[PDB]
Structure formats: C-alpha cells, structure tokens
Symmetry: C2
Subunit: 196 residues, 2 copies
C-alpha cells in the first residue's frame, strides 16, 4: 500500500524521499546511468500512451532491456497491447493500459484484467463523466492486484479512492504536476494519514 | 461540498468554526433556544436509528416542532419511513435512511431516492463489503442531491470520498468520534483542501 513517485529528471530523485516506490520514466530521462536504492519501476512510455518515446517496438524493448540490466528494477511496466512473448523480464510486471480519449465500458476493461499477463494490472483512462467512476469502482470491487483510476482535473479523487478499494499503489508527482489532476507526494501522504 | 459538524453538547458549538453547517442533535442535547448563527440542521434521532430518543412519534415530533420554533433551522432531518404528512416543517428537508445491520441492494435504495418527499436524501448504511461501496456509488452516479456513505470503521473513506460524486454534504464529528469510522471536522477540511 504504497506511494509511487514518477520521476522525469535527476533533480526529482531527491524530491521522492516520502515515496515508497519510484517510477523511472526512461522515455523522459536515462536513469540507467546511476543507482537507485529505493524500490523502483522501469517504464519507457510510448508517445501513443502520453510518453516521449517515438520509435518502433524493437528499439524500445532493446533500450528497456539495457536499462533493466543496469538498474535491476523491482518492476517493469509493460503495455496490455503487447503479445505474451514480451513479458520476459525477470522481475514482477505492471501490465498497463492507457486511454487519453476515454474510459472504456466495464465489459471492455474486465477483458484486460481477465486476460492479464502482468503481476499487477494498471488502468489509467480519461474521466469524462461520473459513470466512469462507476466503471472503475466496479473493476476494483471485483478484482484484486489492480491499479485503476481516472485521469483529468475533475477525477483526481479516484487516485485515492482506488487505494481504499485494494489498489497497491497511488501514483504521485514530484516537482510540478505533469498532467491535470495529479496529486503531490506531500498531498497524498497527508490525505492517507488523515483517512487511515 | 459543505462540511457538516454534528453537535451533541454546548461545548461542541465552540468547536465547529470550520464547518459550513452544524447539525443540532436534540435527542442528545436540548439545543432548544441556543444562539446558532451558522446554517443548521435540526435532528432528533430515534434509538432505532442509532440516537437516543425513546417512545412515541407523537412525543418526538412535538419535541422537534418546539425546537423548530426557537431555533429557526435551515433544514430538518426527517426519516424516510414517515408518512407524507410529517413533512410539514417550513424549511428544507433532509430525508434520511439508516441501516445499522446492512447496506441494501441497489434497487431497494433507488426506491428511497425516487420515493422522496424531502429536498435531500441521506443514506447511511452499515458497510459490510466492497460491493456495498459500488451500490452507494451507483446511487450517487444515478441521482442528484443525495448524501450516501457507509458507516463503520473499514469504510470511513466513503464519508469523504463518496461526496466527490455530487453529495451536498460531508458529515464530520467534533471533539470525540461519536461512532467508529467517523471523520473529524479537521481531517475532513484538510483532505478537501488537499484534493482540490
């Protein structure tokens, strides 16, 4: 039941002391270059999932494999649209699904959780209505080992509700918010100490 | 969202400075003719609903009507099981349903909302599983001006988190927690500040 701080730069390694886990976005900066003692997630986000990696699957996995060797991460984040052959990293896996256009229906997200290759499933989808909160609460009500929350300014609170429905993680920002609705490490810690 | 502090003694009146609204519980303290300048709810809670008013509805309503006259409250809390004619108070009415044993299925709770007499409906039911969180979230998703949360220690988070689905109110304790799972005025304001 942990705070995950997403890091985008070397500046940000110092800002993450309150975090349990740290997410190393190697599409944003090469963390391969220095040692991170904290529990860590290796991610290389494709452009099509709001990241900065713009290149084919081949160069992306090669870059992730070389970073995996030198960081020895606790998790790798791999995407739900990849085939089973790609889930070949020797650690726990976060299998993620991103949607910046919409929250799919319950039926559609249930297929992702149920077809899981990863140790944890992560779902992060654009909130456009309160029915989408419903979709995500159902999913967490019905499955375990799932991080599911809604993105967008209006849906910030779902980041925290999810932990209370069994999500192992709350993802937080360090420095500045990288997108609308993101919650600071300080804020998240305050909120959860208050709620219990 | 407004924060409501439930007052049970004259000491607690001095403690509600950061509440938007105070709920005067006259089954526990004769608030009758108390100078309260803040938005207020008059409530006289039956033992069967977890308070300490015993004997007649005749006695209880007489008690409430006299308390109305002196206090001039903004709302009155009237229970959902009362016939239409009880709703003869000249102010806004919060119609409420308490279940200390159970959170009913969605269809039963929907009936209470659509069969409403009051301006607001309040649903406070004993949380027994995560499925109960989803019931209460469907209700808030499908209806406006409803306060719905789960009672009990394991489901505190719903008292704050569930109000982000359009509830007018968060109910807060002041001084000591009156029931297990209750959220303090302080913690409620801080989470609300930090969430956005």
């Amino acid at each position: 039941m942990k705070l995950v701080a997403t890091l985008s730069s070397p500046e940000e390694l110092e800002l993450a002391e309150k975090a349990d886990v740290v997410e190393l976005r190697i599409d944003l900066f090469d963390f391969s270059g220095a040692r991170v003692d904290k529990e860590k997630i290796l991610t290389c986000r494709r452009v099509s999932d709001g990241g900065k990696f713009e290149g084919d699957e081949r160069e992306r996995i090669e870059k992730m494999k070389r970073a995996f060797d030198s960081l020895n991460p606790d998790y790798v984040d791999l995407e739900s649209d990849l085939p089973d052959s790609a889930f070949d990293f020797n650690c726990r896996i976060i299998e993620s699904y991103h949607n910046f256009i919409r929250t799919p229906d319950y039926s559609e997200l249930k297929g992702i959780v149920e077809g899981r290759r990863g140790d944890l499933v992560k779902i992060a989808t654009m909130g456009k209505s309160k029915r989408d909160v419903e979709t995500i609460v159902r999913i967490l009500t019905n499955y375990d080992d799932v991080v599911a929350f809604l993105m967008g300014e209006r849906f910030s609170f779902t980041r925290v509700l999810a932990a209370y429905l069994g999500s192992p993680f709350i993802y937080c920002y360090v420095g500045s918010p990288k997108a609308p609705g993101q919650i600071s490490l300080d804020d998240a810690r305050e909120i959860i100490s208050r709620l219990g």
